[PDB]
Amino acid sequence: GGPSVFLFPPKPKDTLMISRTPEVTCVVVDVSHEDPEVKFNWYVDGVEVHNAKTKPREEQYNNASRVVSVLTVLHQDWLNGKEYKCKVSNKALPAPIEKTISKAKGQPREPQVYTLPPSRDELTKNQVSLTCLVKGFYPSDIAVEWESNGQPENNYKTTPPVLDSDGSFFLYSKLTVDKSRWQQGNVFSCSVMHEALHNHYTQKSLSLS
Amino acid sequence: GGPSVFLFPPKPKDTLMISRTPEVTCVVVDVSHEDPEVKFNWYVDGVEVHNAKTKPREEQYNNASRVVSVLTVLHQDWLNGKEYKCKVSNKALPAPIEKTISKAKGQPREPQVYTLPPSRDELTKNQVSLTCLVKGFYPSDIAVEWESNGQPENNYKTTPPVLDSDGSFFLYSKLTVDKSRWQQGNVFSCSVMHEALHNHYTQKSLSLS
Numbered sequence: 001g002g003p004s005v006f007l008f009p010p011k012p013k014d015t016l017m018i019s020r021t022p023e024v025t026c027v028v029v030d031v032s033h034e035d036p037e038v039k040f041n042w043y044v045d046g047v048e049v050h051n052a053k054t055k056p057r058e059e060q061y062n063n064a065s066r067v068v069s070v071l072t073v074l075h076q077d078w079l080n081g082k083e084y085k086c087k088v089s090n091k092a093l094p095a096p097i098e099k100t101i102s103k104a105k106g107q108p109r110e111p112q113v114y115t116l117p118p119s120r121d122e123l124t125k126n127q128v129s130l131t132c133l134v135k136g137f138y139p140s141d142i143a144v145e146w147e148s149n150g151q152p153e154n155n156y157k158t159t160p161p162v163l164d165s166d167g168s169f170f171l172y173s174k175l176t177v178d179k180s181r182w183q184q185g186n187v188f189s190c191s192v193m194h195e196a197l198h199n200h201y202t203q204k205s206l207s208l209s
Numbered sequence: 210g211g212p213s214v215f216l217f218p219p220k221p222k223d224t225l226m227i228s229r230t231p232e233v234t235c236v237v238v239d240v241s242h243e244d245p246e247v248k249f250n251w252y253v254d255g256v257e258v259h260n261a262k263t264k265p266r267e268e269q270y271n272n273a274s275r276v277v278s279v280l281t282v283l284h285q286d287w288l289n290g291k292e293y294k295c296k297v298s299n300k301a302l303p304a305p306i307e308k309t310i311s312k313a314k315g316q317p318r319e320p321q322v323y324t325l326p327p328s329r330d331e332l333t334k335n336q337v338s339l340t341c342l343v344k345g346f347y348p349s350d351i352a353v354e355w356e357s358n359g360q361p362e363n364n365y366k367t368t369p370p371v372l373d374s375d376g377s378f379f380l381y382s383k384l385t386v387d388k389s390r391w392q393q394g395n396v397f398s399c400s401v402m403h404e405a406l407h408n409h410y411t412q413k414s415l416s417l418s
């Protein structure tokens with residue numbers, strides 16, 4: 001017994017590209033049956049708005065319900081620091097629950113992007129690691145991708161952002177390719193999207209030296 | 210109203226060095242005042258043991274209490290996969306809460322450790338990044354450190370372990386030094402501790418080529 005509220009920011013890639021649709025998501029869990037109806041009020045910088053959409057009710061595994069409201073946001077509103085408030089009114093609540101999110105505050109800093117070839121030690125293995133170091137960025141909302149000849153690469157993993165000692169963030173992205181592709185002289189690229197880059201996008205290349 | 214239980218494994222460095230003292234920690238939060246007393250029963254592979262120690266009661270910020278029991282463990286017991294069960298008996302509980310932890314199961318895999326010098330692009334900055342790539346290890350319990358001339362370095366950060374595509378883990382550790390120290394020819398070392406290394410320890414060096 002007891003309903004709670006979680007509020008999620010848009011996905012980094014979505015806020016950075018005008019072609020994409022950034023959304024903020026209000027998730028209500030433990031919806032007491034005795035009180036199913038949930039009213040959502042949305043506010044952007046205090047001003048109530050209405051372009052939200054409540055997706056189908058989902059059935060939890062505890063005799064309770066999950067109701068999700070999704071609010072489409074303007075890229076520029078999000079990047080400019082506007083606050084999004086989701087107001088959840090229920091009967092099983094002493095008062096409406098109000099949650100709030102916004103972009104992290106603080107001076108945006110531009111990611112420095114560095115590509116690092118495999119250690120000579122790794123050339124004895126069947127596959128090698130190509131490393132993309134992304135550092136010095138703020139806020140931590142970022143997306144990183146790898147590609148070669150214009151097509152996405154499958155076998156890569158990216159660390160979460162890590163808080164660095166100067167208050168900015170860094171991460172690494174590791175791409176794994178067969179040693180044969182590397183040694184031939186194939187060219188690989190690390191793409192980085194972040195608000196503090198020109199056109200929200202930079203890429204750095206890496207191939208055999 | 211309602212008491213819960215969290216169970217924490219020992220610290221990686223502690224299980225790997227015989228000189229250190231690995232402990233498992235049973236944390237009880239929301240200790241209903243009406244029922245303060247908490248009895249701890251500890252079990253190692255089902256066998257009850259008694260070398261635990263209950264640290265001073267702490268006062269939460271919700272009219273409830275926090276009681277912590279700490280169990281000293283044998284390095285080899287932990288690394289061999291023995292299960293640690295913490296049994297919390299309280300009056301405000303329908304039944305004693307039993308929680309359980311053990312080392313992650315699965316074939317231990319040896320970390321491959323690779324040191325990577327700064328990208329040539331970074332030599333235009335006042336400080337440079339020295340990168341230690343640690344990959345292919347299992348389980349994810351690991352510790353990484355940096356040093357030069359036998360002394361620990363201050364300015365480094367290590368990513369959490371990341372699940373790689375073959376089911377093993379990797380991480381990176383980034384050491385930041387003034388460009389001047391790098392270019393002079395100072396030698397830096399990345400130390401790695403993990404159960405699947407000989408003597409639970411390896412290190413790799415990195416200096417100007």
Ligand SMILES: *[C@@H]1O[C@H](CO)[C@@H](O[C@@H]2O[C@H](CO)[C@@H](O)[C@H](O)[C@H]2NC(C)=O)[C@H](O)[C@H]1NC(C)=O
Pocket residue numbers: 032033034035063
């Ligand atoms: C699922 O939750 C509902 C409440 O949301 C439980 O229902 C109530 O059951 C009590 C009997 O103990 C009745 O007095 C209430 O009037 C019921 N309320 C409603 C809205 O039906 C129900 O018992 C729960 N299901 C299970 C299997 O435990």
Ligand SMILES: *[C@@H]1O[C@H](CO)[C@@H](O[C@@H]2O[C@H](CO)[C@@H](O)[C@H](O)[C@H]2NC(C)=O)[C@H](O)[C@H]1NC(C)=O
Pocket residue numbers: 241242243244272
């Ligand atoms: C802190 O928690 C205690 C219970 O752990 C609360 O105490 C009880 O208060 C009710 C009155 O509403 C009494 O009928 C009970 O007998 C009390 N129990 C005990 C063990 O004292 C107490 O009210 C809480 N403190 C605050 C400030 O809310």
